[PDB]
Design a protein around this nucleic acid. Sequence first.
RNA 1: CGGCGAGUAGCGCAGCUUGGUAGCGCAACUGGUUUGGGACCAGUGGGUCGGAGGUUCGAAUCCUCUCUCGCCGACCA
RNA 2: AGCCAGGAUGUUGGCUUAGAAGCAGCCAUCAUUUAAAGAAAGCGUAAUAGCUCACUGGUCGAGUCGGCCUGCGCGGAAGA
Lengths: 272, 74, 136, 38, 61
Amino acid sequence: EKMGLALGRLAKEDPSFRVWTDEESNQTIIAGMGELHLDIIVDRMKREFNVEANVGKPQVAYRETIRQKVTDVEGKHAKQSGGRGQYGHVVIDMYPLEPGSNPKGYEFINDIKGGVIPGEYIPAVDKGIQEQLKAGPLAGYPVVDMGIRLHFGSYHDVDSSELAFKLAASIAFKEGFKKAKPVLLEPIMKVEVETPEENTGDVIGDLSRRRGMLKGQESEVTGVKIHAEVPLSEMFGYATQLRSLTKGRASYTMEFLKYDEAPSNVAQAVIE
Amino acid sequence: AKKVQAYVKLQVAAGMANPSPPVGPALGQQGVNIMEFCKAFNAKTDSIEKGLPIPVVITVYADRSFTFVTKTPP
Amino acid sequence: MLQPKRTKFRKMHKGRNRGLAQGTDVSFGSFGLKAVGRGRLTARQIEAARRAMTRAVKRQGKIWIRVFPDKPITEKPLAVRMGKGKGNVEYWVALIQPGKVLYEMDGVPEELAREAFKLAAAKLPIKTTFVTKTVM
Amino acid sequence: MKVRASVKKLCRNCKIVKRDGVIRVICSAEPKHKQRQG
Amino acid sequence: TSYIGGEGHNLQEHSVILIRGGRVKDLPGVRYHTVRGALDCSGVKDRKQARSKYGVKRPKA
RNA sequence: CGGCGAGUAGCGCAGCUUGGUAGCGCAACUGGUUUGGGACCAGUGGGUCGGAGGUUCGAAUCCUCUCUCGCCGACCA
RNA sequence: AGCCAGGAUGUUGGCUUAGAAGCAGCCAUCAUUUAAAGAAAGCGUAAUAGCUCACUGGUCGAGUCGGCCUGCGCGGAAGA
């Protein structure tokens, strides 16, 4: 609270100083003009506003997908208590979406001829999986490239509510996810470097050392513009580093572009 | 052209213009203004045949003036 | 990781490593690593030296490993008073006598074969030497 | 420098001199190659 | 815990709002209200009828 | 670890004593009865015996070696 | 062996074409100009450029260089 009022007000002294919001973590994102600027800001309030909110470092996204497709995972439901004997079974066939640009990274085609599954239960099977998109059974994370097809089902004629079928999708989704091995992905950053003439050679080091792939290398009269994509996670602190090795005669522009299949060495880290 | 006075040694497409993207740091490596040359690059590059990769030589003084030489498309 | 596939007797005596070696000429290849040493060459020492020549050829060569371990060696668990019969087999070993041909590279050039042995030989315990083909 | 039982002519200009009974390596201007204990 | 009228808003989780009375008969325990048009919780987005409530400045046009 | 004891359908237990042909139960599947579910009433499929190797004509079975899990001890200074 | 010198051409020889320009790597490991020069043994770059080497000419001017087999030595070698 004494930060919300502080950094809230601390947005006026330096409108070059930014206050933000971690996606679903809400931890305040701070953007400034260098550790020097930030550090000074840290103690600028340590006593002036007594602000002891231990600012640290940013946080990753790490969304998920599936390595491959499934064949015929089936999940039924056997709650035959009596009078409301919940009974719901579906035969889903999940397929990863191949890198496209449809605003939704999802594709659900309804493969039921009806009778095998009564029609008005389409939304049920549909939203049934839609629930499991916030429970990534590795570390509970959202998934991408998800594409689901449904083969057939099963019902009981005095029963099988939406509840029966909202769960049938709820249960059998992870089944193919189990069959079709998942993977952890990360945001990849589009960077347009700018380093005069000489350090051009030396700048490539950090560009590549953080596992970044040099796409385009350009130049002009007294300047140079370089292209590459590099993971967001493995890009923090760079503002300092770039000027830390070019005599500040350099700056850059950065933006997200894509998600990719990270390696396992990376994978056994987000487990938490 | 001296032995080597920072002259580009390969080229760009015979009919294309603005050798900016592919070679990148090397064409303007001497400070060569693409402006002054790209208009004349094609002048004797569009001359024989367009689009068939030819090799060109552009050797620039410190007094900033080149000499134009071309060789056989590989 | 060579090992006798279902021999008769499980355990066998200590024996003695004596006399000049017998397999002493380049059977198949043009080059070889003949062992001047005299001693017990274990199974692991075989695999190590093999791959370490498998790389110098990189893929391209035919290689025959002459020696086969064939001799079980026993041990004793590290907390026992001496007694209670023969111990447990732990690893196999191929006796060597001086003059024994161990490896053969044929087809590859001479120097690489020369270069090849060095890498592996460094892993071998007993001193060895470079031999070249002779007719009869 | 480095100490090790076995030294070798690593680069093109490696040199070896039996200085005071000790074997060592003096390249020319390649610093990372100085060795002794040969 | 209060009621948030105005079919949406812009603010959340770090601000100063202004409460009023007003139970809801529809949720457990909730008995209050924010004040659309107050400090951080704004006058609602372009409505006409009964706009005094919901703090809509009279549309000049 | 050495020293003895089990490893059998889906699950849990007989059959191994002495060699020939693996049984019972709840489960699963199908039908009946009911408005439907359960219970109940009639049928059925399912292991072929933990594994490696021998004994013999033939091994769940008699032996020998590993691996899984248990009971027992790893004591006198 | 030194001191003086040349050490190049088509031509980045395609790909993974983001760049493999005599030198990250792959295949060929060409053929011309020739006293000579590998489309390369090495250093240096993001890649060039740059300094040499292979090899070849001048001078000085005589022996010199690389393997194998032995004998005798040095290093490896730190305790109260």
